[PDB]
């Protein structure tokens, strides 16, 4: 069968460079064209470029945004595709994809994440919610990176739960908000896996 | 709950032990309390208590 | 010029019935050699996406014979004979007659068909820590509202508040929006939807 | 604390003569279990 498995996530900031190689197992490399497509979060994907078979040999395309910035190489003993960063810039910090083709994108692998953000990592500033007489919640602000995970009564409660997604400001850091809506005091917990910053939350109106 | 459960089993025992006699169901459902009540009754072969 | 590819977007999808995604062309995509030049993708909300049809009918292997699509010259349709609960996600269709491939559409998120729900406005004042914390984020929470077609307005105007959506559960079949309106320290001495659930705009400030 | 929790797979709590009583949530839960006879015969007899 075959696989086109990436490697090379990591966390930058803007005016460096980064690697990004994809596994190719499986098949003749030399015959499918190696093409590159970046996934904003939250949003649709978008193709950053491609290289053209050895036996054809052709050239490389890459999209108007990437020009001079991002180059494609290939080989066949080796069979790993390369896809180069430098001059990295904020509109980078998102998912990119393998795919198996110029224009057919036959196949995608699982996606790396390539963050570019201005933070490093931080502790959290975790900020509770006041219900007005209902639901209650509990901000995480300022934490880089994403690893979080939030859970309501230490892991107790499963009905209702929510965490919000990472929030996108411009300081580079981000926001996450986990809220219970039930009726009635309840505990929330947020574990930052590199910070190791243990926060425990009680909350009142 | 799991503290509650280990201090009542740890902190008094007792001297209960578990033995079976040959008493008929009914006739052994009269034993209540006074550290002779049943623990399981069986039929009218043998009793646990 | 480029192609205008705009399938429409927003259909819902509830498991066990026949549904049907149509799509744009500005000029014909129907070239020469008698076949079309169009792709229809699935994104995997969490993962990797995977093809479904090719030269706008030909089905792709692997995935099951559930994706059904033809087309005119330039009217296209991908009609999905059925869903399941697993057959949810956002389609694409990437049309594939002038590289270079940058875009692929905006993208229709499907989910599971239901009917309207009210949607429930929370209005959260943020907390005194905060403020004197150097921050202040005023959340009007919205949960339990489908489907997704309302934003969160912020008088006394908008500008600072954020759009933070997460994607559809599995029992409730519902969804959920944060509007964290990031704010400073002397500019905090009301929000809205505008959702279908219902018509008049319900006023509830902090 | 006075908040919901979730629970499990339903058992049979025998202490009350068969298996009838779910679970006793009762605070002499334990002191029913530890005193009063699980009344075996007629719980053995159901189950069978």
């Known amino acids: 069968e075959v696989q086109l498995v990436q490697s090379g996530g990591g966390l930058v900031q803007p005016g460096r460079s980064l690697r990004l190689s994809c596994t190719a197992s499986?098949?003749?490399?030399?015959?499918?064209?190696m093409s590159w497509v970046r996934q904003a979060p939250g949003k649709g994907l978008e193709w950053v470029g491609f290289?053209?078979?050895?036996?054809?040999?052709?050239?490389?395309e890459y999209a108007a945004s990437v020009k001079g910035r991002f180059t494609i190489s290939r080989d066949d003993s080796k069979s790993i595709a390369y896809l180069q960063m430098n001059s990295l810039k904020t509109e980078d910090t998102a998912v990119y994809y393998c795919?198996?083709?110029?224009?057919?994108?036959?196949?995608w692998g699982q996606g790396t994440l390539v963050t570019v953000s201005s933070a490093s990592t931080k502790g959290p500033s975790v900020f509770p919610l006041a219900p007005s007489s209902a639901a209650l919640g509990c901000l995480v602000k300022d934490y880089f990176p994403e690893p979080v995970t939030v859970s309501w009564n230490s892991g107790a409660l499963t009905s209702g739960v929510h965490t919000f997604p990472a929030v996108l400001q411009s300081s580079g850091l981000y926001s996450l908000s986990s809220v219970v809506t039930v009726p009635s005091t309840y505990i929330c917990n947020v574990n930052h896996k590199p910070s190791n910053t243990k926060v425990d939350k009680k909350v009142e109106p | 709950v799991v503290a509650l459960r280990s201090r009542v089993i740890a902190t008094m025992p007792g001297n209960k032990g578990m033995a079976s006699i040959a008493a008929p169901a009914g006739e052994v459902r009269a034993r209540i309390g006074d550290r002779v009540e049943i623990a399981a009754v069986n039929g009218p072969r043998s009793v646990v208590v | 010029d480029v192609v205008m590819t705009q399938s429409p977007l927003s259909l819902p999808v509830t498991p066990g019935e026949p549904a049907s995604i149509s799509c744009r062309s500005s000029?014909?995509?129907?070239?020469?050699?008698?076949?079309?030049?169009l792709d229809w993708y699935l994104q995997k909300p969490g993962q990797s996406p995977q093809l479904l049809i090719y030269?706008?009918?030909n089905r792709a292997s692997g995935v099951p014979d559930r994706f059904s699509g033809s087309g005119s010259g330039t009217d296209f349709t991908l009609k999905i004979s059925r869903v399941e609960a697993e057959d949810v996600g956002v389609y694409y269709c990437?049309?594939?007659?002038?590289?270079?491939?940058?875009?692929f559409g905006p993208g229709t998120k499907v989910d599971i068909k239901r009917t309207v729900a009210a949607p429930s406005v929370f209005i959260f004042p943020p907390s005194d820590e905060q403020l004197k914390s150097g921050t202040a984020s005023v959340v009007c929470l919205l949960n339990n509202f489908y489907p997704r077609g309302a934003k969160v307005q912020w008088k006394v105007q908008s500008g600072n508040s954020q759009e933070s959506v997460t994607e559809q559960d599995s029992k409730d079949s519902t969804y959920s929006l944060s509007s964290t309106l990031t704010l400073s320290k002397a500019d905090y001495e009301a929000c809205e939807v505008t959702h279908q659930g219902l018509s008049s705009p319900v006023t509830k400030s902090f | 604390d006075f908040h919901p929790l979730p629970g499990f797979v339903p058992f049979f709590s025998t202490v009350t003569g068969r298996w009838t009583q779910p679970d006793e949530l009762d605070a002499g839960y334990w002191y029913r279990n530890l005193r009063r006879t699980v009344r075996f015969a007629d719980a053995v007899r159901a189950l069978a």
């Open positions: 795919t198996r083709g110029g224009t057919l994108f036959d196949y």
């Open positions: 499986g098949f003749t490399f030399g015959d499918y064209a």
């Open positions: 290289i053209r078979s050895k036996a054809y040999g052709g050239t490389t």
């Open positions: 000029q014909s995509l129907l070239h020469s050699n008698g076949y079309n030049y």
């Open positions: 030269l706008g009918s």
């Open positions: 990437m049309q594939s007659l002038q590289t270079p491939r940058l875009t």
